[PDB]
Amino acid sequence: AEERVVVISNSSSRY
Amino acid sequence: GEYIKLKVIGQDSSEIHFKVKMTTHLKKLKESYAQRQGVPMNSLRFLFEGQRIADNHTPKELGMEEEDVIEVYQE
């Protein structure tokens, strides 16, 4: 397996 | 602040690493891990030093540091 690193990071609305 | 990198170990000894901030709610890590394993989040339990990680636990609350390990077991 290769290394796996995951990064955990209204007026325009039209609905 | 800075990201810390946590190692999440599966029942099969596979690893997915996650970068989280000290104030990140670890539900976000659980969701991403379950998504990548293709299973419902509620089918898994996530342990730090054998203790259950809550949705709203943060690394700061748990005293986590760079390269700490999370273990995943079936619920």
Side-chain angles (χ1 to χ4, degrees):
Chain A
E2 304 201 353
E3 192 180 64
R4 289 181 286 175
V5 182
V6 176
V7 178
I8 302 294
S9 298
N10 247 339
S11 70
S12 291
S13 299
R14 285 289 176 170
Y15 302 101
Chain B
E2 299 179 18
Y3 288 114
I4 60 164
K5 178 197 264 194
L6 300 172
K7 178 192 286 193
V8 179
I9 308 173
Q11 290 170 289
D12 61 1
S13 263
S14 66
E15 299 172 0
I16 305 182
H17 292 81
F18 293 85
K19 279 181 173 180
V20 296
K21 300 291 182 84
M22 293 305 298
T23 53
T24 302
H25 298 113
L26 289 167
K27 195 183 187 297
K28 299 297 194 187
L29 177 155
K30 299 179 187 183
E31 295 170 0
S32 180
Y33 186 80
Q35 180 192 30
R36 292 162 187 279
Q37 295 296 309
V39 300
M41 197 186 93
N42 67 6
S43 73
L44 302 177
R45 59 189 171 113
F46 296 77
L47 307 184
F48 176 62
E49 308 182 332
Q51 311 289 8
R52 180 173 293 251
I53 301 171
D55 285 357
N56 281 314
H57 261 135
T58 66
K60 180 182 174 184
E61 282 183 333
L62 290 176
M64 288 167 160
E65 306 178 342
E66 179 72 6
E67 289 176 13
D68 269 339
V69 166
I70 294 173
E71 295 176 82
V72 186
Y73 291 88
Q74 292 305 301
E75 185 58 276

